[PDB]
Amino acid sequence: GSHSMRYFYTSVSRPGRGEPRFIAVGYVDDTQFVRFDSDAASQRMEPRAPWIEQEGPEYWDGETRKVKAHSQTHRVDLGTLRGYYNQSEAGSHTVQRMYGCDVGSDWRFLRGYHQYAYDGKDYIALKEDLRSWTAADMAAQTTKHKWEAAHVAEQLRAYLEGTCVEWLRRYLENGKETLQRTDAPKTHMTHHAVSDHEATLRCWALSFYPAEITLTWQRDGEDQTQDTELVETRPAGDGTFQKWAAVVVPSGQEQRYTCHVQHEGLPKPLTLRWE
């Protein structure tokens, strides 16, 4: 199918306590492979996947220099935004950045993206034509004018359409055993007696990859979306994910309820019913 490479950066200001904390992480699809922590003693971009360690010291030197550059740009952006919004230095603030590229089944460039956020809310983003910017406030409008003047869109487009996708391909090839795999979910069902007349049925999907899944409960084949409890997909800690969905049913009606599981590792979606 399609694949993605994405870099996430986060810098939070510590007033008076020191320079802003900066943390960066890299992902291919749903697998992390690099990190940087400005509070860490190494002060290096470190590997987090086994298939990226095959890279020599030059790759790491380059990625460390680049991530430090991005840290410095964030360090300036914090004050720039504090000025654009007329905020006092006493407050701790957050600047988040995320960019990357998606590739199709032919492994050709499919799309790119580049977005910023301040204190948790959208600040500016690159449009899907890779030629224009969407801005939220008048400060984002100012950043947009600056970037339109400096021809940022053309350079970013060149990067995304060349190097981002090329090294996404190379990472997919180096870590084919990890990244080019699909793990179907192992599914089962659980039954407990919440009351003398009600019982909770719980549909479990475990040990699946990629994280994109869908669990649906149905009654008489009708969607139970409003009365089904559905937890966020959670990481198992070893490259796989977990999820479950529960419904409360009157005792003696379980055979009317079905759990439907949709995942790329399944040839057909699964239908489960209590026995």
């Binding site: 680049k66 500016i124 350079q155």
Partner: peptide, 9 residues
């Protein structure tokens, strides 16, 4: 691999 340019707001 990361982008080489320094981008400011």
């Amino acid at each position: 691999k990361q982008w080489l340019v320094w981008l400011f707001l």
